[PDB]
Amino acid sequence: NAPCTTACGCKSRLLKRLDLYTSKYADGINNERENSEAYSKLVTAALAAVPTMQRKILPLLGAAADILDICRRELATARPLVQAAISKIEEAAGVYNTLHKLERGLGEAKIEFGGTDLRLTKTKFRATSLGTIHTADCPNADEKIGLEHEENEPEPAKLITHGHLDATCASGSSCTAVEANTHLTLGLTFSGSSKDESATWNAATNNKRAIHSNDADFLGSNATVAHEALKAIRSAGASTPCSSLITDFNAVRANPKFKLMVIKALLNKPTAEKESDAPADEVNNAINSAYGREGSEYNTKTWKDIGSTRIPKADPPGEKTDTIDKLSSLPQWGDAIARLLLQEIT
């Protein structure tokens, strides 16, 4: 809720926010895999099973096709938005990796004139840290993230907008002109606000003060467009694609094509085309008989019986048979379907 304030924290939050979306997308990919498998199992079993079993599979087919189609279309819609966010967030992370290197400044040059004269060689530069970047890893401890929280989450912070010329001058005492015992120290630091401490420093230069600032906008809009890319997913309603499963009776039960095919296939009224063509109690009683009461046995029995349907199996000494669940691959299911239809032709 409060803006991030360190490079390690901003990167950590931006990546954690991205994970909200990519993990949900990965769930959809897995769900599309399971729905594809389920739909293939239904078609194969619907061809191979005995009529009492076939009649229980048929009401699943149109509704399952509806779930699978929508699931694929939702993933296809989300795919470019998630890809766009990934690219933009990871580029911003790259800049944060550098802002962490600069978070302690860039060192200093300190001249100590020695005491004898004001001649100068490298040996009078006692400090020469200038150009040293910060190399330590992020602190191991540091920092509500959730899709519900995304709408008011603030932009990632820019952290550094200015570089500062730090200066110290101490004679003898304040710079009393520079003489043989004078320490002159000049450094470069960064912050998110401009600094000019010239007023206090000119009356007491023996204190390190930022005496000039220059523009150093490293992030530019990178964090803004990454932030906006996350909103683009939410605006399109693409944050949780393909969340419905064919193996969830709640998804199937709600489809009008399911109820209608219960009437056609399980209440012996095959010419029905409206939901009203049978009394609701007879639809419900048929549902109860086929799938357990209110579909309570859909997974414990219906999908188990579907998986135990025996289908043709290729073999060099002659075609054999086994169950859908034992030959659990699309190539074997497609081969069975071809073989089942050939037997009907033959």
Ligand X SMILES: *[C@@H]1O[C@H](CO)[C@@H](O[C@@H]2O[C@H](CO)[C@@H](O[C@@H]3O[C@H](CO[C@H]4O[C@H](CO)[C@@H](O)[C@H](O)[C@@H]4O)[C@@H](O)[C@H](O)[C@@H]3O)[C@H](O)[C@H]2NC(C)=O)[C@H](O)[C@H]1NC(C)=O
- Binders of ligand X among 194-253, rule CB under 6 A? 220-222, 225
Are the C-beta atoms of 14 and 274 separated by less than 8 Å? no
| Alpha-helical runs (H) found in 140-248 | 198-201, 222-235
Considering only residues 65 to 94 of the shown chain, the ones binding ligand X according to CB under 6 A are 88, 91
Could you tell me the smallest distance in angstroms from the CB atom of residue 186 to Br ion? 16
- Residue number, 142 or 250, with CB nearest to Br ion: 250
Q: For residues 52 and 121, which CB has a smaller minimum distance to Br ion in the complex?
A: 52
Task: Kindly state whether residue 171 participates in binding ligand X, applying the rule CB under 6 A.
Answer: no
CA–CA distances in Å: residue 52 to residues 45, 49, 171, 249, 268: 12, 8, 103, 20, 12
Closest to a second copy by CB, 72 or 310 = 72
CB-nearer residue toward a second copy: 301 or 339: 339
Give DSSP secondary structure letters for 10-59. Answer: HHHHHHHHHHHHHHHHHHHHHHHHHHHHHHHHHHHHHHHS-HHHHHHHHH
**Which residue has tokens 């073999």?**
315
User: Quick one: which of 8, 20, 81, 93 contacts a second copy (CB under 8 A)?
Assistant: 93
Residue 241 makes contact with a second copy by CB under 8 A: no
Q: Name which of a second copy, Br ion, ligand X, none residue 8 binds, using a CB cut-off of 5 to 8 Å depending on partner kind.
A: ligand X
Q: How many CB atoms lie within 10 A of CB 57?
A: 25
Could you give the CA distance from residue 11 to residue 23 in angstroms, rounded to a whole number? 18
CA 255 to chain centroid: 30
Counting contacts by CB under 6 A, is residue 145 touching ligand X?
no
**Residue 147 has what DSSP assignment?**
G
By C-beta, is 69 or 143 nearer to a second copy? 69
Tokens 């279309």, residue located: 73
Site string for a second copy, 7-26 (x = CB under 8 A): --------------------
Main-chain dihedrals φ then ψ at residue 113, nearest 5 degrees: -70, -10
Q: Which of ligand X, Br ion, a second copy, none lies near 249, with the C-beta cut-off 5 to 8 A by kind?
A: none
Q: Which residues contact 304 (CB under 8 A, 6 or more apart)?
A: none
CB atoms within 10 A of CB 346: 5
* Residues from 137 through 166 that contact a second copy (CB under 8 A): 162-165
Q: Which stretch binds a second copy (CB under 8 A): 2-10, 122-130, 146-154, 301-309?
A: 122-130
Beta bridge partners of 111: 125, 184
Tell which one of 43, 58, 61, 138 touches ligand X (CB under 6 A). 138
Q: How far is the CB of 297 from ligand X (least distance, A)?
A: 46
Residue 229 is a binding residue for a second copy (CB under 8 A): no
Residue 115 in the binding site for a second copy (CB under 8 A): no
**Contact positions vs ligand X (CB under 6 A):** 8-9, 11-12, 88, 91, 97, 100, 137-138, 140, 142, 220-222, 225
